[PDB]
């Protein structure tokens, strides 16, 4: 297999429409997590990819296998846990702040928290090109980040999403001195982040000098998402830049982990960075026009077509 | 007030349509929790009731107040916890049984089950006419299992359903301990169950038997709930039995709070057992054809139309 | 035209789930009124058929008007009315009574209830072979009635069906004068009503009884109409009953209309009782089956099929 | 209570879809009339407020009496009137000007109508801070205005929305008649108003002017809203702009109520008008992006929030 | 692979409602097709199960292939066809018949009907248990045909389900031509058949003749479907009946396949017929009670429970 | 009839949710077909419009036939045809490109392609003052290509959407030499095309050159369609250009219909091209902001509003 992820999948029940949960009557459900979101994106360009996971022994761990595996995914190490639940969460939508989400998590002590060293073959890890994992996955537990710690060691190369998400953790200082010591552990072949996290880790907004202090980490490539404003990816003292499209924004949920998972397939195929990044700014823009994470994720030569045809 | 329940209220998510929860894409957000379900027949029967209850501080807490509020259930009771979060579950419709819905709940640690002896005063519960709870509240933790044993100590008389799902014990035998010792313990003024229950509580299931038994337990008014095929009330040496209406089945869920405090409530007020037995089954009709445990539970006047002209 | 009713047509709001209006979010909007839901029966049995109406200049009105004319209704003497509003109902489904309806009417002052003698023009009239009207065309105001007393002097046969709708009355004694009144003047060639009415107007309630006395008033063909126990059509010496058949009711209002429209329009084709008798069971039975009243009426032949095939 | 509110609640049926009501085939109900969506704005910025008001003894009645309750609006002074029927009215969405609504009401001779002089009680106005109305209450019935005069006359202090609705009257020049009559006879602690009635109150367009005018009047504060152009604030030498947000429009009807009762309330409580302004701003901005008109009006804390964080 | 199917996958578009199409506004997507259907009933009893078939080089082509292998049927040999399309149809309700469905097909020359003897692996097909297919894929086109004579000359064993719709066959004779030729020509294993396909095919309805009738040309176990009246089964001289359940019909289609790809998938594992049919008859009444053909066919353990608990 | 216009009708089943079909659950039905389209922008304008096309004899056939009906189209030239079926297609929206829709046809041996000179009647055409057809009605068959031929032969006045479909043509060479025959052999009052269809007839894409290339082609009036760009119109030696207005996009689908409908209307009627070209983009506006190409469509006067209204 390509790429690796290891992460908990997530049951996500979307609101029908904007405003405060307790006036929303209806919910729209899809299947999402980012690794899960990641790795649809890897197979849309053609690399296979498999979740290393745990779902509930229930319907909602049936639906993330089924989903998973309808779309390309390599299910074999997605683990059923009998002992705990399948985790959900809700999406409020556009409040208080107009074209923004916030999500509500019932999440505590799922089965997939329960991720574990355990789940992590030596043998398996090593075939792979590319083991990816994200900051969510390191603050679910201490067995899951413990799980991230085994598969980087193992790994050829690895990636990280930061994705800092402060409800997971008891405090930004843990969040922080956790993806700080994987960081200075490891190298890390593509880093995926913001300025909302890299203030909290580097106390750096400023993407030049993100970049700096990263490569001093020993971050090869780094990808620095600007939200409504592009984003920018780093490689050996270069520099790209794609701005953003203006589009109607309904979820922008999963945004990055389209863009990831597409910039990170397509670097690992060997396109340059320019390419990689206007593709992983087309796979964002496309699903934050709708409610799911990962449907909307163009295959690479649908990417081509946004790319040649949207003004 | 008139009646005071003690319970946990949830959020209900139902399924729009029938089927295994992995190919619902949609559902449909209701107000629920049993001691909620019969609050509601209470008040729609003219007595004033409280709910004792704590819901978390987030949307679905607030969901749940506002929502009681607006149907005219005294909300004075229901705390807002802010040490952890609104329990929720999860319908699944005619998988695999036919007119019949399974629950999946996320619950766990919920602030619901942080109902504990503190929130519990003397002065208010002696105030009242009559205290209701259900196994359920006896099942979700050690603390209100103790809060319904202590308000059954103050009260001046006592209704409890059964209500005994397995998911939410251990075992059935703890089930039938826990059960059992109240009975054992308290006069109950109406006890509702049926012979799902009776059989792990007594190793019956025959109605005249049942009696038999739970008068010995101090049980004045037994309500033996048979489904599809009506129920029984029994009274001193009285036996009064209606048959089910046929109609179409949404989801039963709810149907036996709706009969509980529809019956409750108008025995209370002098109604003889029959006429609230015959309520009972008409609010029980009523809802069981909708999504949504309570917001088709008749009033007192509603029923008596119902009965006169529905065949 | 063959058949020319006066009435107003109407715009219906059904909730898209049954229970109390205060708890239905979702209303699905359906072309109506008695008269308009008949001259559809009347054209699917192929006649041609004119309903003679105001609507407002609004757009409801314009509704009225297409929906009309795309379901092949003469709409040339349907009025657009400047100084009034279209009128309107909803219907609330299911609650107090399953599988019964109740309407809610904004109709009061409306363009509809404007229509007037004014409106009847003696050579249209004298031209068509039936005029039809209703109980409730009588009811909804004096110039309405007065236009139907006009259409009724002028016409060679007539139709009505009572209609009592006791909302749209100052006193039942009201509608038993008016409409007796309209039985004394007049000749009837199809008298369509059922037990209720027919107490209120003859104070009997068997069917045989109910034709001797309605043919001194005059009337050749008696409906009667007997909901889920079937019909009973009567004409010289015939007598012919069919019973109803057994389906899922999503919402009964408009079955009479689709029974009379069906009935009165074979009836004129030289149809025997048995077999107008016949298909107006099968037309009625369809529509019950959906939320709107006009929709499933069958056309002759499909009302065939389902009298072969149904049972 | 702080404030007293005089008005109609309404039941309004927007429809799902932007087009011409003839193709509209869903309707979706929520709560609101001018003075509702105002007192929702009111105990959002956490003050007590009382609606005056009649409904009818039918489910719509009961609709507003629960909603309102739901919310925390004081609903002890919500009439219900069995001689007249609950007020409706529809939205007809983008079309055929994009982003604007247009209502039709069906509400002549309501019971929200029959609001009168006998509903207004001494010593209740006189033990609240601030009695508020609307050019619609002046418009809807004799009584309706006369019952405004009397609280108005009673009152500590008064705020008036001039909120002129063409349809409502038999002529601007009525309106124009009618609502200065008000302004000369009283002092008006808040005026909200904007150009479009403005210039018909005062034949003048510059807001500076409509300042100098309205104090002449007896107006201490003036709301002056533009729209998509913001909205400026006056109190004595102080005036205060704010620019109007861009988000995506789905129904901007109440926004200028959830604008109002946010300005009022805060600045009953000291707020300056700045900051009353930036709220009133903040409350408009977020209710026009769904279809009801008070589900989104945030709270005080909210709207803090969307000002801080939304650009 | 235990069970190999040969088929042309579909689309169904369900009406949201009843009615004749012209008046259904919404149309629910479901992926279907009687080979498909069947497949998804034998991987539900736990058996391997590949579908050999065409589909379009187009986005429900592919919703075939995911759909397929979410549900853990083997799609290595469903081909993509470039040279056309997938094939759908649309399903009228209940018109003019209560509680029975109408297709209507977009299939002609799609790329499932390319289906052919080149398709058809002889290795594949040896290494097989059981193959299936039916009248459908008979009628197609003449190379479909011959590619169910081809994989049935290779078959270790063969299930046929006749499946007569007359809209595909030139003509009924042809139908019944086409099939009695392969029932001549080749030992079945299991026929699954019903008294319409056995009127043409023998001139038989009688269940008892039917079965010696088609073991005289070589059939092993007759299924003998009764629609509401149940299912027959017989093997060596035995006879096994089942009746139906009662339920509400929202629509059939697809409950034969249902009830024989699992009857033929636990008969294969070694079950008995009496517990095959009771299966079959689980199968079939929990696909009828709502739109799509497949998602509610129970998995082998939870058919038991249906049968142990559903009365 | 003033205008007639030769065509296949269609019916479009447009996605509830944007992305690819694969994803999509519920399809919204919708009567559309570009002549039809623009049928709908005529009557919408004041002058009579004839539909000379064929239908199946089947519901979407009849749904056509009552849709142009209700709409005021001339329907006595739409001819059901039960030799073969009604055309249909699919609508998948933003995906791959947002804010435009790429269609799915089931139209092949449609009953609309079987449009043949036979049902082109010389005095009936003559007998109106323009006729128009669109590169679609050239593209569907050789029979409905030579239709169009006739018509334009025997017509007063002549107007031509280039409409270039490259799915329906077998080459690009093929559409330009079958369009550039047309346009070389007739006077063009108006044609209607864009730079896509302009490249491929021309190999310019420059608006003031193919208004001189067009010229010498006999093209009077030239509509030039730029979408978001807005659209420019040519006639003698006037340009007049309009901006696109900034909407929400739901569907583009018909937009260019909808304008050049209205543009041809206006203009036939006296109007000058500034007039004509504003109300198209007007008409277009409206209908790019829902699923539906037409409902939207806006009478002379709403458009009038429109242009005078918003900004
Ligand atoms: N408002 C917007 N308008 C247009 N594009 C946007 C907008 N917001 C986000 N995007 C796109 O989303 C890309 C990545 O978004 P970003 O906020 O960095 O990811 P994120 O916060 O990781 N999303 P998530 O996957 O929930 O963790 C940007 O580079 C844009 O291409
Ligand atoms: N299939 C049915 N048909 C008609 N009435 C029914 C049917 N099922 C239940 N009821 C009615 O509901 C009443 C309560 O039955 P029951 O199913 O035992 O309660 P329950 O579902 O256990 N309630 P709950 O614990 O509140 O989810 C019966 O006495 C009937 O009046
Ligand atoms: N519950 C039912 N079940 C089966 N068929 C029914 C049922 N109700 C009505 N019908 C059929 O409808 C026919 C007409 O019924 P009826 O109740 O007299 O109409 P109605 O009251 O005049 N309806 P309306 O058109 O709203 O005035 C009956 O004779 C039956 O064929
Ligand atoms: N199109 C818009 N875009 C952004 N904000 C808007 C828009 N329309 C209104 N608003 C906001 O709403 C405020 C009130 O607007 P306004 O149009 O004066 O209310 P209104 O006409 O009184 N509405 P109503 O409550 O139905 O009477 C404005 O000052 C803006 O903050
Ligand atoms: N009206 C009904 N009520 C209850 N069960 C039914 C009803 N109709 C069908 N069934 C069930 O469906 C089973 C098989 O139905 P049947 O009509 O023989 O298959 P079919 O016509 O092949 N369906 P299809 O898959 O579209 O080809 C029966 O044995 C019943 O178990
Ligand atoms: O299981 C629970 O706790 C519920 O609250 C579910 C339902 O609301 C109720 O119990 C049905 O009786
Ligand atoms: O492609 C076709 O033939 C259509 O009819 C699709 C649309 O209705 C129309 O062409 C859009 O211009």
């Given at each position: 297999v390509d790429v690796i992820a290891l992460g908990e999948p997530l049951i996500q029940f979307n609101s029908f429409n904007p405003g405060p949960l307790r006036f929303v009557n209806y919910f729209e459900k899809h299947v999402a997590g980012s690794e899960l979101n990641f790795c649809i994106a890897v197979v849309r360009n053609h690399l296979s990819c498999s979740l290393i996971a745990r779902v509930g022994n229930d319907e909602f761990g049936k639906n993330i296998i089924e989903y998973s595996r309808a779309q390309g995914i390599d299910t074999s190490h997605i683990k059923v846990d009998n002992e705990s639940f399948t985790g959900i969460y809700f999406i409020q939508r556009g409040?208080?702040?107009?074209?923004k989400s916030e999500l509500v998590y019932?999440?505590?002590?799922?089965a997939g928290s329960?991720?574990?060293?355990?789940?992590?073959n030596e043998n398996y890890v090593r075939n792979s090109r590319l083991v990816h994992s994200t900051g969510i996955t390191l603050a679910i537990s201490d067995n899951a980040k413990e799980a991230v710690i085994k598969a980087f060691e193992l790994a050829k190369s690895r990636s990280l999403?930061?994705?800092?998400?402060?409800?997971?953790?008891?405090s930004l200082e843990k969040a922080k001195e956790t993806i700080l010591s994987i960081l200075k552990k490891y190298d890390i072949e593509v880093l995926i982040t913001d300025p909302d996290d890299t203030k909290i880790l580097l106390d750096v907004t400023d993407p030049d000098e993100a970049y700096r202090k990263y490569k001093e980490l020993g971050v090869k490539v780094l990808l620095y998402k600007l939200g409504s404003k592009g984003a920018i990816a780093y490689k050996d003292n270069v520099k790209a830049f794609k701005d953003a499209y203006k589009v109607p924004v309904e979820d922008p949920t999963g945004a990055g982990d389209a863009m990831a998972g597409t910039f990170v397939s397509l670097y690992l195929q060997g396109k340059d960075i320019e390419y990689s990044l206007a593709h992983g700014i087309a796979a964002s823009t496309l699903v934050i026009?709708?409610?799911?994470?990962?449907?909307?994720?163009?295959?690479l030569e649908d990417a081509e077509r946004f790319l040649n045809e949207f003004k």
């Open positions: 409040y208080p702040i107009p074209m019932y999440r505590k002590g799922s329960r991720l574990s060293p355990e789940d992590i999403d930061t994705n800092i998400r402060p409800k997971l953790w008891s026009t709708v409610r799911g994470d990962n449907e909307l994720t163009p295959t």
